[PDB]
Write a protein that binds this ligand. Structure first.
Ligand SMILES: CC(=O)N[C@@H]1[C@@H](O)[C@H](O)[C@@H](CO)O[C@@H]1O
Ligand SMILES: CC(=O)N[C@@H]1[C@@H](O)[C@H](O)[C@@H](CO)O[C@@H]1O
Ligand SMILES: [Ca+2]
Ligand SMILES: [Ca+2]
Ligand SMILES: [Zn+2]
Ligand SMILES: [Zn+2]
Lengths: 403, 403
């Protein structure tokens, strides 16, 4: 395979999601859907009466469902959140403005998302492809919490004053907006609940948002495949445009990102409706893209596999990463995986490399890491692998409490 | 060896009274488990609770275990519309135990809301290893257990559709439980599919006399309460306990995991000088004394996170013995001594997963007649077997029969 494409669809489940999924199924591929459950409540200002149907269809078809927050942060676009808020924020177009404010409340939206999904589809946890409590992606934000050493933020994703295209708009990644700062804190809060978050490499979007029916200008399949070819092994989260889509400090060349392209797109771009004739014009682009991408040697996978599953029989090199039971591990020593020697909190063969900051067992801590433990912050003074006896409040040779 | 293990469990905190309870436990040199309802943090729980957050912090800083007792103690099912006054409204009627569970999906959701509220008021709470809000739960009103796949049982008369246990004409039929009970059974199953264990109790430290104006004053004295604990030790109390709504009728008497252990239920609010009596002045001394004399009698105190004993390297396990490892219950396949690199897991030959859940799961020893959920469908285990990845119920029409 020349690479692996991860088709990721944001902002469903909506009516438009249904035909998208059928195109995927016909194409013989699985995708990842980052869902906002407010559509299930009928308050998301989309054609969304088939939201539940779409959710079930996504899950019955084997696609992965991940967590895009309950309301896409629309509570931070309006004065008081309610059933008309999506339409209000759509009226103003202030989505990217003050998008994150109180990061605790904003992170709680992701958990509210689990509540609502599990409300409308009480069986959802019986689906192994339901990953709502494991995989997430922040509204507006090309931000990543993949592993302890694969993390980076969208430093100008959202603004305190002006939308990006506007004159005089400033973006200083070194002194990011308050919204960006808050969004970083959300990332951290989620990572401490065990989420990975993933950004994207390429965004399948209207080439022109200024024309009527802008969804019609979704990149045609052939040139889109060119964009994908260009993103492959090219650290495109740093070079992608527009600016609010960049991940400025993305660890170019980080091993898990090799030979992979994450495509972001939006279900709503594939309906015939307020944005254009997206079903008529864009469903065949999706279909053709899948066909010609396969032809060209790409395979398609899902974000539960973006960090590969630990596999019995496979030989691992030290430093290689796996996902095992939702936790990221990094191989300590090269070896071949066998049945009883899975990664764990006590394995000598692996350390826990989750992208989290709370003190955790069997983590290779590095000098300069700051960890949280029983409500305090501690600076790691000497590198070591955490173990139960070496708690930060009792090991001042390893940790120093910060003020 | 100790005479047995006592698990002090305090329900309905965090409130003001919690603080002095915690201090006495601390002076007693013991750790307890608090099953909390976060509505007190919002100040709508109708208790003296301005120090709720102080109490939560103190509980966690003192090393006590925090477990999930749901956000509002199901008060939303005691009133027409849940709101800031519903606690008082329900205290006005005394209908806590009537229609206590209705929509199990919604009631189970209160346990997740509890997580949200706790993590809102104390954003650092996940940095406490003693925070087990997302792992350990107890249903309001209900002596119900989801411990292991072979250690589960319900409070078949815990809650009612009409009358309370003391009202004449009240009838408890375990064989044909109330609707509220059936709903609570579903809540147990929902939480268990989210990874919770739930535990009931063996003895309840409560007013000896609810008919006086200051009922808290009649909390059993230390010596005779110790006698109750003694009586409970190895004698299947959940079946014999009174009142009837506190029974666990089908409790697996003699089940090994329950041997030599006594779980004590009590309530923080019984240790307050206030509307229930002189709880602080009268009951804090009883608590202190009970701790002293229990120890002198050979008992040790432990927390509910250890009720299912944590897996520990170096310990020898026997075939069929249960452990907890990373919040998951496992059951030993053969007698062996535990080694660092051979931990229980989804792929371990030494252990099977024995969580008390019903969703189809890897490496579970299924029995004939077990019913599992998988991708939205229910399957009868026709051929008992240990589940593996290639034997998903949708593809194994000999091992499983679709219902
Ligand atoms: C231009 C456009 O379609 N923007 C949409 C907005 O309509 C929607 O409410 C939001 C949440 O899904 O996502 C995007 O910002
Ligand atoms: C008689 C008594 O004290 N009942 C209490 C009730 O007051 C309280 O609101 C509820 C939830 O905390 O727990 C108990 O049912
Ligand atoms: Ca995880
Ligand atoms: Ca668990
Ligand atoms: Zn989005
Ligand atoms: Zn209670």
């Amino acid at each position: 395979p020349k690479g692996t494409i991860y088709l990721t669809f944001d902002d469903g489940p909506v009516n438009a999601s249904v035909e998208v999924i059928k195109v995927l199924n016909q194409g013989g591929v699985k995708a990842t859907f980052y869902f906002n459950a407010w559509h299930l409540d009928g308050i998301g200002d989309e054609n969304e009466d088939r939201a539940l149907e779409a959710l079930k269809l996504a899950l019955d078809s084997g696609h992965i469902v991940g967590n895009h927050s309950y309301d896409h942060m629309i509570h931070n676009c309006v004065e008081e959140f309610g059933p008309t808020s999506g339409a209000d924020c759509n009226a103003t177009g202030n989505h990217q403005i003050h998008s994150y404010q109180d990061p605790v409340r904003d992170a709680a939206s992701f958990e509210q998302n689990l509540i609502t999904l599990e409300k409308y589809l009480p069986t959802i946890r019986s689906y192994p492809n339901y990953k709502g409590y494991e995989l997430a992606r922040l509204p507006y934000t090309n931000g990543w919490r993949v592993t302890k050493h694969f993390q980076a933020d969208g430093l100008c994703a959202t603004s305190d004053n002006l939308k990006p295209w506007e004159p005089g708009y400033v973006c200083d990644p070194a002194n990011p907006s308050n919204s960006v700062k808050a969004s970083i804190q959300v990332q951290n809060i989620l990572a401490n609940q065990g989420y990975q978050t993933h950004g994207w490499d390429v965004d399948w979007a209207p080439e022109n948002w200024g024309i009527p029916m802008p969804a019609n200008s979704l990149t045609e399949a052939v040139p889109f495949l060119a964009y994908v070819d260009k993103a492959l092994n090219s650290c495109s989260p740093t070079t992608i445009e527009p600016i609010n889509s960049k991940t400025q400090e993305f660890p170019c060349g980080t091993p898990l990102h090799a030979d992979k392209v994450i495509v972001l797109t939006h279900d709503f771009l594939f309906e015939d409706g307020k944005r254009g004739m997206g079903a008529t014009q864009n469903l065949p682009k999706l279909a053709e893209f899948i066909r010609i991408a396969k032809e060209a040697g790409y395979v398609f996978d899902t974000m539960d596999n973006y960090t590969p599953r630990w596999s019995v029989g496979k030989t691992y090199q030290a430093g290689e990463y796996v996902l095992y039971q939702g936790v990221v591990y990094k191989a300590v020593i090269s070896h071949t995986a066998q049945q009883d020697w899975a990664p764990s909190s006590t394995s000598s063969l692996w350390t826990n490399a989750d992208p989290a900051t709370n003190w955790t067992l069997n983590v290779s801590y590095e000098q300069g890491d700051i960890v949280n433990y029983k409500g305090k912050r501690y600076l790691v003074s000497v590198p070591h692998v955490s173990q139960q006896d070496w708690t930060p409040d009792t090991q001042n040779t390893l940790f120093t409490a910060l003020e």
